[PDB]
């Protein structure tokens, strides 16, 4: 229903705890939270967590 | 020989074997320092790059 931003990983990132989201370059992430401070939140393959906002690029809807 | 050692403030996980995973409290022996936010060091048998602002200088 509600609109949702989609981003694609520019680089690999490996989570250090369960509140962070791991991904490989190219993975498609559905964004749930955007905030200042270097981290955004999103979902990937049934997992949710925070990731570096500078590690992703936008996807044109 | 004098050596530079740093202590991890935060956890970091490698994305490949040229990078060094560590846990908060680990002491790392620095092997290379460069501009750009990445340093290289050795911990417990492995050597790799890691974020410089995840660690703090200590003394051996």
């Amino acid at each position: 229903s509600n609109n949702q931003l989609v981003v694609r990983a520019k680089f690999n990132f490996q989570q250090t705890n369960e509140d962070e989201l791991s991904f490989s370059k190219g993975d498609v992430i559905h964004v749930t939270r955007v905030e200042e401070g270097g981290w955004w939140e999103g979902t990937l393959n049934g997992r949710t967590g925070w990731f570096p906002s500078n590690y992703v690029r936008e996807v044109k809807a | 020989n004098n050596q530079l050692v740093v202590r991890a403030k935060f956890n970091f996980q490698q994305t490949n074997e040229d990078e060094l995973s560590f846990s908060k409290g680990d002491v790392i022996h620095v092997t290379r320092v460069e501009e750009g936010g990445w340093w290289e060091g050795t911990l417990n048998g492995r050597t790799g790059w890691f974020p410089s602002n995840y660690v703090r200088e200590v003394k051996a």
């Binding site: 401070g37 270097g38 981290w39 570096p52 590690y55 | 460069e34 750009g36 290289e40 974020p51 995840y54």
Partner: peptide, 21 residues
């Protein structure tokens, strides 16, 4: 046997972990 390791990762380092107010 000190090997030759590569340059810094070409990507920027991740920021320090999130710490909300």
């Amino acid at each position: 046997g000190k090997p030759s390791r590569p340059p810094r990762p070409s990507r920027p380092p991740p920021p320090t972990p999130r710490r909300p107010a």
